Symmetry: D2
Subunit: 268 residues, 4 copies
């Protein structure tokens, strides 16, 4: 086969071996992609984690709140992949919201400065990364960001859901710019995945009530999904991101693909 | 009749006699409401404008980015309406986005600090105001915010559309808190209205292309609306906000009512 | 007050004193409307039930599957309200699906003839009634149909949910025709209401599983609704239909207003 | 590569060499799929057309309005693919609406019998085919139907848009049944494609106004699509259907993938 054979793809967002971006990177290399990775603050830890990927991949530092990192990103990537080559895919899998904007801290008590940091990292940065990278992307390219369905409110996720609503809207504008380069921009809305942090939260890290509510949310997800949902398995989400990075959804942009077991299409 | 007879309603957002909140205030007083107004920076100008309203209404200063204004808002309103009385309605009609986030300035060139100010004023503040005012609202009360449909991208509005997407998501969370007080929270998504600023923009204030595009957007709106759309008339939008402030939509919250001529329900 | 003062409104759909149309008629007369009622097969029973309405209202027979009834409807209504007068409002509150299309009978086992009857009565008829009545409606008029949110599948409702999906689509086309008359067309999506039939179904009339599932659906509705949901009280739904029949939502058509406690805006 | 290597896929809907199902079949064979085709009435013509496909494929007759064809379909397919083998994919690409339900014939003038035939063929049949075929489908299988976005009304398509709204709702119920077999069910919402019939319609076959409106609809589609839209090329739509038939979107069901150039995500 080789779904992504020959494609050069930048993958951001790996922080632990349970990160959804770690599985996206693994599956993309299994599929023939040549990768460049970006990591945020603990580069030594990230390098050690990505050593377990099937193939080597250069790791570049990128703090999306750092204008300088962003301004120099395209030059560093070109250096990593070689003059004359461009990227075919970009994976944005970054997100963050201060504790005051999630959990049991009341929705009305999150200070704007925390919300703003969260929106900067989780939403604005999708536009930041596309701005930095489209100049070095090939026609037929694909930009994919990680989302979760924020069309209805829900317990605990609070401001992070607002940040996803902003992100879905940013994606539709990025598609307009990306289109001028022959590039698609889309998001994958995933079901809940037991990442290290999510496990910490279910385990009570942000208050017992938030944990109980997240837990309830996960069970209802598998019940509602007509094909079921396994929160411990990120592979189905990684495969979907690879589908969008491939040439097999060439007429979809500014769009959202739901890799959630079909749960969002069922009331109960 | 007297649709809002006896209700005490706070109305924010009046800046000129063409402000949508000026018409909402006028219609609400025609309907029997007793109002309290809040204004942002030019209080002398706002007082002079609101002198033309059918009845008197106390004017309080409120800069939604000022924590102190917000912290003292409930006490000032109680003083204006009298100890022992509470509000039955709150109208949020505030919005703003720096020029870099709208117009012909490229979407990718808006700095985050500008976007963040815009989201603070246009979205977060809906939660700020509800936080400040629910403690002084009566069961059966109603909070209404001004929106425009951001479900699809569009030219020129750029980051302001992202700010509406965030606002619609904030509204669904505010409904959850407001519900504990027996209060509803909803938004009215209006068609384009020729406010002073919008007229300035169509006239070229943010670049000729942005103006031409806004103009095209307005014409297509009236064509698509099965009952037509008159951008020079804010009355149909004011009436809709009054419908939500009344007791005649008592089972709708966390929701959006479209006062746009039905344009959003038609492709062409 | 008098929300509907002086308006002539046709109300279809009354079959028992627990029919949602019975409450819509009662509230509309409390609000000053002069009504004309249509009933389907048991006119003697319907007359006896509507005798309890606050005011008298002529009852006309109308089987929406009868072309002749439809062809003569406008003439009979004009006779009931008097030559030279026209209707200002029309309420469609009719729906039906054979048992094979609902309940525990498997979704795949409903024969098309049953589904087709159900869609004829529940969806096509909204266009049939508008076709018959727009010629005798005044500018500023309003047509309202009863809906329930079919955007996601759910247990038990099966083909009736498909019929609501068709109805919402018919409504957007009827708005286009109604607009030529200066008339609005909208639907009210209600939460579950304990009508006689729904009570029969919860009580097991279409299989124990369907009943258990409907029951579960109702409880979750009140839990999800930020202001709660009372399935035994149709008044909040009647008031919402009256809001659309009034002149207070004059810029909304081809649209759906949710009178469901805000449940559809919350995941959990 | 071989995206569909080894999969057995039934493809319905081929009537001319410009049929979207002809391209779906061609691309699926280019990708390694072994096909079985079904055709509706002119089997001699269909056989002659499919002779041009890259590989041979048995052709079975199937009139979805024929209960007998449906009742015997699974047995005929098993015979064509051999005892002990099951299908991995099913493509529903059938649709039809009598002329009275489309075109310049007024929306209110389509008789229910025509609408009902149209809904039978275009919507109910998606459930009919899944009912017939799930018993002979393998876990991990995929059912895909052709759709066009009916969320807003539009000129000319009239009742066919209502039939798509019904179909999208049927798909969400079929996903629930298909899930019990480990099978996904999804639709691809395509942009306008110049099929023989659509070309006939643009050319005036259903009235000059319908043609002018369809033409306007197509131009606006390419303008709105951030990556553009080529109505003469069905390949991008075929590739998307193959993506859903593959194992690369394994967590999506009861869903709709838009292969429309991203046009539905942009207002203008
Ligand atoms: N359950 C989940 O884990 C989940 C996660 N996502 C998204 O998937 C993406 C990856 O998250 P994950 O793998 O769960 O968590 P993660 O902690 O493994 O990694 C994401 C990255 O955030 C990156 N980071 C933070 N700040 C920066 C910065 N300033 N610059 C660069 N990088 C930064 C960080 O270093 C980390 O690598 C995010 O966009 C998530 O929101 C989408 C859907 C679901 C989800 O949250 C959900 C919620 C409610 N309903 C359904 C689904
Ligand atoms: N066309 C329009 O004018 C329009 C306006 N709205 C909303 O209606 C509301 C009122 O806007 P308007 O009447 O047009 O304009 P406006 O300039 O009259 O007034 C709004 C208020 O913003 C207030 N302001 C700014 N900063 C602050 C602050 N820090 N604290 C307190 N107040 C502040 C300001 O003083 C002013 O009174 C806003 O939420 C708008 O976004 C909603 C829909 C439409 C619209 O923009 C649109 C766009 C695209 N498609 C369809 C419709
Ligand atoms: N729970 C409910 O009772 C409910 C009802 N509605 C709609 O409200 C309307 C009235 O229904 P109801 O009051 O519950 O029941 P009903 O039995 O009182 O009356 C409706 C009418 O159907 C009329 N009828 C049947 N055939 C014909 C015909 N051929 N010609 C003329 N009239 C005919 C019949 O005579 C009866 O008067 C229908 O469109 C319903 O579908 C909308 C929402 C909810 C709902 O079903 C729901 C389901 C799932 N989630 C949320 C909400
Ligand atoms: N533009 C298009 O051609 C288009 C087509 N589709 C769908 O694609 C599918 C294939 O249509 P096509 O390839 O355009 O046309 P087609 O005429 O090539 O073929 C479809 C099949 O209908 C089959 N047929 C009719 N009755 C029966 C029956 N009783 N039993 C079995 N088969 C039957 C017929 O024999 C034919 O093979 C249908 O579901 C379409 O509605 C989806 C989207 C677009 C579209 O219509 C559109 C409209 C508005 N905005 C955007 C897109």
């Amino acid at each position: 086969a080789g779904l992504l054979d020959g494609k050069r793809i930048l993958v951001s967002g790996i922080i632990t071996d349970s990160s959804i971006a770690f599985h996206i990177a693994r599956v993309a290399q299994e599929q023939g992609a040549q990768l460049v990775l970006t990591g945020f603050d603990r580069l030594r830890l990230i390098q050690r984690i990505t050593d377990r990927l099937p193939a080597k991949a250069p790791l570049l530092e990128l703090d999306v709140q750092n204008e300088e990192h962003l301004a120099s990103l395209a030059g560093r990537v070109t250096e990593a992949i070689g003059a004359g080559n461009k990227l075919d895919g970009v994976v944005h899998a970054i997100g963050f919201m201060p504790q005051t904007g999630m959990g049991i801290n009341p929705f009305f008590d999150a200070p704007y400065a925390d919300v703003s940091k969260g929106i900067h990292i989780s939403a604005y940065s999708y536009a930041s990364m596309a701005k930095a990278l489209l100049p070095i992307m090939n026609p037929g390219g694909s930009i994919v960001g990680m989302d979760f369905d924020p069309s209805r409110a829900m317990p605990a996720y609070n401001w992070m859901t607002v940040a996803k609503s902003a992100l879905e809207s940013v994606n539709r504008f990025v598609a307009r710019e990306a289109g001028k380069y022959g590039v698609r921009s889309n998001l994958v809305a995933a079901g809940p995945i037991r990442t290290l942090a999510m496990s910490a939260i279910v385990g009570g890290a942000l208050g017992e009530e938030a944990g109980a509510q997240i837990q309830l949310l996960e069970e209802g997800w598998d019940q509602r999904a007509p094909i079921g949902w396994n929160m411990k398995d990120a592979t189905p989400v990684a495969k979907t991101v690879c589908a969008l990075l491939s040439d097999w959804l060439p007429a979809t942009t500014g769009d959202i693909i739901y890799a959630d077991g079909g749960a969002h299409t069922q009331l109960l």
